[PDB]
Amino acid sequence: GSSGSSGCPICLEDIHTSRVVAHVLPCGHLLHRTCYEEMLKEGYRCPLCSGPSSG
């Protein structure tokens, strides 16, 4: 379950700035320097910010 839509939608693990760097998306979300590199390859953008048909 997930009540708060605040967290890396890639790995789904509470991000910890202190622990590791967080990539602030241009939409208003945080990611993991690593994850941000994975999603880019796959071909999917912020799966949280609903968009058009695609995505």
CA dihedral 43, 44, 45, 47 (to 10 degrees): -170
Considering the rule CB under 5 A, would residue 40 count as an interface residue with Zn ion? no
Considering the rule CB under 5 A, would residue 49 count as an interface residue with Zn ion? yes
Per CB under 5 A, the list member of 27, 40, 44, 55 interacting with Zn ion is 27
Per CB under 5 A, the list member of 21, 22, 30, 46 interacting with Zn ion is 46
Cα dist. 39→1, 16, 18, 31 in Å?
A: 22, 19, 22, 10
Least Å from the CB of residue 23 to Zn ion: 9
